[PDB]
Amino acid sequence: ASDEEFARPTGQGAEIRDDGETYTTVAWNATKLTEGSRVTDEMRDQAMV
């Protein structure tokens, strides 16, 4: 969203004027982070941990 502004000093019976929210955007591009580990079956079985 656009930064906040201030409402306007207005006469009685006078038109309420427009200062609408103007918009922009920021892009995301999510990078894949990966880590693996390999263990032998013998190691997986024998570990105390």
Residue span 7-36 as binding mask against Mg ion, x where in contact by CB under 5 A, dash where not:
--------x---x-----------------
Q: Which stretch binds Mg ion (CB under 5 A): 5-13, 29-37, 39-47?
A: 5-13
Give the C-alpha separation, 36 to 18, whole Å: 56
Cβ distance to Mg ion smaller for residue 13 or 36: 13
18 assigned binding-site residue: no
45 assigned binding-site residue: no
Give the C-alpha separation, 20 to 39, whole Å: 60
- Say which residues have a Cβ less than 8 Å from residue 38's Cβ, sequence separation at least 6: none
Structure token pair of residue 45 = 């079985």
- Mark the binding-site residues, compressed into ranges: 5-6, 15, 19, 35
